[PDB]
Amino acid sequence: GIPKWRKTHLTYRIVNYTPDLPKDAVDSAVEKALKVWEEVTPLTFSRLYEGEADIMISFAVREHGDFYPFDGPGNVLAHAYAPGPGINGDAHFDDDEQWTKDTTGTNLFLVAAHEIGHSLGLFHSANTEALMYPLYHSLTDLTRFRLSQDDINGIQSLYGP
Template identity: 40%
Template sequence: MKPYKKGPFLTSNHTQKPIMESKFFRSFLITIITSIFFFLLPISSDSSMDFLRTLTGVRPGTSAAGISKLKQYLIAIGHMSEKSQFANNDNFDEELVHAIKSYQKFFSLPVTGFLNPETLDQLQKPRCGVPDNPTATQSRIPAVSYFSFFPGKPRWSPTKKTLSYSFPKGTRQDAYAAISAATKEWSQQAPLKFAQTPDYDKADVKISFQVRDHGDGSAFDGPGGVLAHAFAPPDGRLHFDGDEQWVDAAQAGKMDLETVGLHELGHVLGLGHSTDKDAVMWPYIDFGVRKHLNKDDIDGIKALYK
C-alpha cells in the first residue's frame, strides 16, 4: 500500500513518523513563538549607570573610559572627597582605591579596593541621592543598630509639633496618597505630626518632582541611578526624579512612590542612611518593592528625638 499524506506529516499505513516536513514546521513554529515571547517582554530603559558595565575587571594603576564618571558618582554619594584634584580623569588612582574601599566597607562588601562583580552590581542599583556619610554619627551598638544621623545631628525644634507639607500645582495625583501614607507611618514613631497644606511656599516640607539640574546643587541623572533626595532639618525640601517610572504600588519594573517617600521623609526628619538592608533608610531601593519602617528605623528616629 502506498503511503499517503495527512496534514504536515508523511505517514505509512503501519506507524505515523514525522519526517523532514514536520521537523521544519516545528522549528519554524518554535522560532515564531520565541520571537513573540521576546517581543512581549518589557523593554527596560537605559540607566544612567550603564557606563559601569564597561569597567568590569578594571584594576588600580590602569585607565579606562568611565572612571571619571565613577569618581563623580562616589563624590556625590559621600565616599570620595569633593576636593579631589583627580576627579575628572580616567585614571584608577590611589584616591579611587580608597573611595571604593570606603564604599565596600559601608555596604559590607569584600573590601578589595577594585571593581569586583559584587561592587559593580551594587553600584548599578537605583538609590537615594543623599550621601552615605560613612563618617557620620552612627549607633554606638553596631551589633544591634545600624542607623545614622546627619553630621551635627540636626533635627526639628522640640517646640515644633506639626510639620506642614505641600506639593506645587500640577503634581501627579498618586503622589498625594503615597506621601500621606508615609507621613502617617513616621508620625506613629516620631514626636511630630504631619499636616498637608495648599500653601506650598509656606510649607515646612516642600515635595516636588524635578529633572536633571534643578537648581539645588544636586542634579538628577535621568532614569536609574539616583531616584530622589531630601535635605536635613530644617530645610524641608524633598525631590523625586521626574524621569523615573513611578507608581503608588509594588509593581514590577516600577518604583514605589510610598517607599521612596517614606525613605526621603526619614531624611527630612534628620535620619541618615542605615547599613541594615531591611531598613527603609537603607540607601538602595529595588523596583517593584514596598517597604515599611523596621526596628532599626524606629530605633533611629527615637534616638534622634529622645
C-alpha cells in the same frame, strides 16, 4: 528626643506630581510616607498649600541643576534636606522616570517614605529591612514592609526618649 528645632508639629506641602500615574500615586504617597512616621512616633502634621510649609515636597524635571541633572531610569531617584533653617524638610523627585506604587519601576511610595524619613531629620541606616537603607531595595512583597530596630533608633532619637 530632639526633633526639628524642638518642634512637635510640622506642616507639609505637596508641590510635586507624576506624569505617568494618577494623583493618588503622588499625593497619597507623600501622606502615607508622612504618616508612616505618625503610625510609629507621636508626631503631629498638617497638609496645606499656602506658600511654603515646614516640609516642601517638589518635583524635579530634567532641568534639575541644583544637584544632578535628569538620568532617566537611573539609580538616582531623589534627594532631600532636613537640618536647615530654610531647606528644612525639603525634597525633589525625578519627574523623568517610571514612578510606580507596585515596585514596577521607581516605587515612589517607598522612595517618598525614605525621603520623608530624611527630611524629618535622619540620614542612612544599615539594616536591609530599614526604610532608610542607602541602597535601592524594591521588594514586590509589600506585606513585609515594616520598620526595624535600626531605623527605629534613628526616628526614636528624633521623636522619642
